[PDB]
């Protein structure tokens, strides 16, 4: 029997079932069109396909049936797509390579758990019969990772990406510097990386990216159809690059390196000319590696700052991010610090966060400043699950896969229009992760919740039948390798 059709996550707007199903045989091929947008994604396919059925898969521009990518005009988007399966072949019909991607994304999870094999298995080889037609509901659907706290490589990054390219993120948000950690090469101001790279949360070495590793990063990132969007964080959280440049601090004495996991201590000296120097050479050197929309300008703070020094510090530093032609993002405190025209703030409060500042959240989207949500009692990956959790935190309280699903962001921000609300995203924080199977147990299975929130109509958002589709996956993870939490709320066959 072939899986389902619906059961794929995200859910896919509308799903309509029938027929006989496609078999890949040994005869099946990918066709595509003829060019070169086309053919990367048909080789991205047989490179999916033809280590677990061991047939040959070739891709051509010619052929009846097999499985075709079809760049063509339709109600697609820069991102949808439809997916066609009968017995005499799978179409999948998309306006760009996005798209075509994300089809491909649905027909692993259609195929079986034995395709993610990189060895060849069995058959038979089995796609539901019907059709599906899909689009996102929301553009902003991203995943961070924390690269500061602990440093992970480029291929640890690589890895990543695989994984959240799964489920239809778009956007990958790296935090790429902290109290612990500067992980990106300035050649202004070189000390940053070499010695504010140095170390990590508990002494060990750290590490950096030269320029060329994240330009690297970058391509890998592009060519799994997600825009990198690269968090600066400031004026707080900037420990590393106060102990690498004594003039940047207020006294002039440069910190050690920091290698606890405390937060709130730092700050970059809002009142000294130098700060707004060293600001505008990291945002311009970072800009120029940045091909996406967005530059990331954090906006934690220290327990010390006065809110008239946070404003000033942001009156001065967002126009720096326009004039590199990027757009402002900032956690939600910039709320307070009127965000510039198009900028979008991130929003990572609790349910026990006040009243007046989910109330200041919310004026300024009602201003028409965008939201990003990402509630730290929703969706920071780091959480615990329940108080037996080895790693992670626990400051939000515990965050079981249900919790971390079960809301609508369209409905969640009192005040807040529903209109302004651009996405949602996954942020995994690395206090306490130092390996990938670590970021996968604590990623997995909430990260597809969170994407299925991003792309998924909220007509489709139910748990009871969510957690099915959810149990669904558990045995394509374990023939990728991918390590998780096997929650007692999910029903795991």
């Known amino acids: 029997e072939p899986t389902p059709l619906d059961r794929v996550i995200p859910a896919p707007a509308s799903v309509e079932p029938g027929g006989?199903?496609?078999?890949?045989?040994?005869?099946?091929?990918?066709?595509?069109?003829?060019?070169?947008?086309?053919?990367?994604?048909?080789?991205?396919?047989?490179?999916?396909?033809?280590?677990?059925?061991?047939?040959?898969?070739?891709?051509?521009?010619?052929?009846?049936?097999?499985?075709?990518?079809?760049?063509?005009?339709?109600?697609?988007?820069?991102?949808?797509?439809?997916?066609?399966?009968?017995?005499?072949?799978?179409?999948?019909?998309?306006?760009?390579?996005?798209?075509?991607?994300?089809?491909?994304?649905?027909?692993?999870?259609?195929?079986?758990?034995?395709?993610?094999?990189?060895?060849?298995?069995?058959?038979?080889?089995?796609?539901?019969?019907?059709?599906?037609?899909?689009?996102?509901?929301?553009?902003?659907?991203?995943?961070?990772?924390?690269?500061?706290?602990?440093?992970?490589?480029?291929?640890?990054?690589?890895?990543?990406?695989?994984?959240?390219?799964?489920?239809?993120?778009?956007?990958?948000h790296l935090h790429i510097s902290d109290d612990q950690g500067w992980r990106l090469a300035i050649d202004s101001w070189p000390r940053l990386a070499t010695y504010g790279g140095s170390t990590e949360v508990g002494g060990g070495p750290g590490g950096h990216y030269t320029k060329a590793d994240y330009e690297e990063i970058v391509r890998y990132a592009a060519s799994r159809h997600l825009e990198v969007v690269p968090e600066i964080d400031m004026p707080g959280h900037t420990n590393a690059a106060l102990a690498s440049y004594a003039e940047l601090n207020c006294d002039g004495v440069a910190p050690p390196l920091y290698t606890g996991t405390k937060v709130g201590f730092s700050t970059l000296c809002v009142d000294k000319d130098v700060t707004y120097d060293f600001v505008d050479d990291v945002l311009g050197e970072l800009a120029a590696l940045t091909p996406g929309r967005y530059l990331h300008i954090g906006g934690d703070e220290a327990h010390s700052t006065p809110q008239a020094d946070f404003v000033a510090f942001m009156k001065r530093v967002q126009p720096i991010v326009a004039k590199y032609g990027k757009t402002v993002v900032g956690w939600h405190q910039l709320a307070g610090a009127e965000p510039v025209e198009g900028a979008l703030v991130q929003y990572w409060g609790l349910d026990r966060t006040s009243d007046a500042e989910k109330a200041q959240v919310a004026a300024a989207a009602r201003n028409g400043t965008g939201l990003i949500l990402s509630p730290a009692d929703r969706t920071y990956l780091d959480m615990?699950?329940?108080?037996?959790?080895?790693?992670?935190?626990?400051?939000?309280?515990?965050?079981?896969?249900?919790?971390?699903?079960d809301w609508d962001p369209a409905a969640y921000l009192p005040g807040a229009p529903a209109e302004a609300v651009r996405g949602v995203e996954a942020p995994l924080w690395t206090e306490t992760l130092s390996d990938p199977d670590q970021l996968d147990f604590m990623a997995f299975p909430r990260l597809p919740g969170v994407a299925e929130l991003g792309w998924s109509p909220a007509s489709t958002h139910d748990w009871d039948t969510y957690k099915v589709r959810l149990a669904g996956q558990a045995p394509h993870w374990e023939a990728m390798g991918i390590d998780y939490y096997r929650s007692p709320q999910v029903p795991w066959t």
């Open 20 to 172: 006989a199903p496609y078999r890949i045989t040994r005869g099946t091929h990918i066709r595509v069109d003829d060019s070169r947008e086309a053919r990367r994604v048909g080789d991205y396919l047989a490179d999916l396909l033809r280590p677990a059925t061991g047939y040959r898969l070739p891709v051509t521009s010619h052929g009846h049936g097999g499985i075709r990518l079809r760049l063509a005009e339709g109600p697609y988007g820069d991102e949808g797509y439809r997916l066609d399966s009968g017995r005499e072949g799978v179409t999948i019909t998309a306006r760009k390579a996005a798209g075509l991607f994300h089809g491909v994304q649905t027909l692993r999870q259609l195929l079986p758990a034995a395709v993610e094999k990189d060895s060849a298995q069995p058959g038979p080889w089995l796609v539901a019969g019907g059709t599906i037609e899909d689009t996102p509901r929301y553009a902003w659907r991203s995943a961070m990772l924390d690269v500061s706290r602990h440093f992970f490589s480029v291929d640890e990054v690589k890895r990543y990406i695989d994984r959240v390219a799964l489920y239809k993120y778009n956007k990958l």
């Open 384 to 405: 615990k699950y329940t108080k037996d959790t080895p790693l992670g935190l626990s400051w939000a309280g515990y965050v079981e896969v249900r919790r971390s699903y």
